Amino acid sequence: MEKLVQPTPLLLSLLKSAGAQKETFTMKEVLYHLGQYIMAKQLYDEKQQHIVHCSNDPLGELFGVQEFSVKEHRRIYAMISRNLVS
Numbered sequence: 001m002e003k004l005v006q007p008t009p010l011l012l013s014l015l016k017s018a019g020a021q022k023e024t025f026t027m028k029e030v031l032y033h034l035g036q037y038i039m040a041k042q043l044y045d046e047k048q049q050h051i052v053h054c055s056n057d058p059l060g061e062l063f064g065v066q067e068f069s070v071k072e073h074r075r076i077y078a079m080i081s082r083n084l085v086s
């Protein structure tokens with residue numbers, strides 16, 4: 001079986017805000033809902049479509065960054081791991 005992960009309170013609140021309805025997830029599911037949140041809040045750069053702007057959004061505090069690229073997968077996994085129950 002795939003390992004299920006357990007978001008800490010802030011990340012959990014974001015994921016539910018995007019439509020998640022449980023407390024544990026596969027990493028694929030966490031990433032899906034995070035992607036939905038980003039799309040819904042229109043955080044993508046208009047011209048460089050892989051760039052996500054967080055400086056005006058609570059996601060910035062959650063991840064601890066001002067911008068990131070969706071191509072930086074190791075970085076995104078790291079940002080999520082800091083917000084999982086160990």
Ligand SMILES: CC1=N[C@@](C)(c2ccc(Cl)cc2)[C@@](C)(c2ccc(Cl)cc2)N1C(=O)N1CCN(CCCS(C)(=O)=O)CC1
Nearest residue numbers: 030031032034035036038039049070071072073074076077
């Ligand atoms: C762009 C994109 N890549 C994904 C698959 C991704 C999977 C894993 C990892 Cl580590 C990183 C990225 C994902 C799911 C995502 C997931 C999490 C985050 Cl933080 C951002 C994006 N994603 C996504 O949600 N979207 C939103 C933007 N859409 C843009 C479509 C427009 S077009 C012209 O390209 O058809 C499609 C992809």
